[PDB]
Amino acid sequence: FERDISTEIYQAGNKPCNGVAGFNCYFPLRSYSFRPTYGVGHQPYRVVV
Amino acid sequence: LPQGFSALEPLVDLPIGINITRFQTLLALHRSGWTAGAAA
């Protein structure tokens, strides 16, 4: 029951990411692949809890 | 601190659901610089 809204770059190594991706730095946010011509895996589902 | 027993009834159950790991209290100042009364 916690929402994460931090846009900080995840750091794996000892090199500071300085807000951008690079060596041992990756963007935590990834986009979906919702398309109507694909299978169930790419089909968006409206989930209400 | 006085010595005694005082019941503490619940007031508000707020479902915030966020991360909290630090806090800081607020203080109100009076302008006459600024002068603050005795408080603890």
Number of strands of chain A: 2
**Largest protein interface, residues of each chain:** A-B, 3 and 4 residues
Shape of chain A: elongated
> What kind of sheet is the major sheet of chain A?
2 strands, antiparallel
Termini Cα gap of chain A: 11 Å
* Helix/strand structural class of chain A: little secondary structure
Strand content of chain A: 5-15%
Task: Summarize the amount of helix of chain A as a percent range.
Answer: under 10%
The helix-strand sequence of chain A is EE
- Helical segment count of chain A: 0
Oligomer classification:
part of a larger assembly
Radius of gyration of chain A: 16 Å
Q: Describe the strand arrangement of the main beta sheet of chain A, using strand numbers.
A: 1-2
PDB class: viral protein/immune system
Keywords: Spike protein, RBD, antibody, Viral protein, VIRAL PROTEIN-IMMUNE SYSTEM complex
Entry title: SARS-CoV-2 Omicron BA.1 spike trimer (6P) in complex with 2 YB9-258 Fabs (2 RBD up)
Chains A, B: Spike glycoprotein
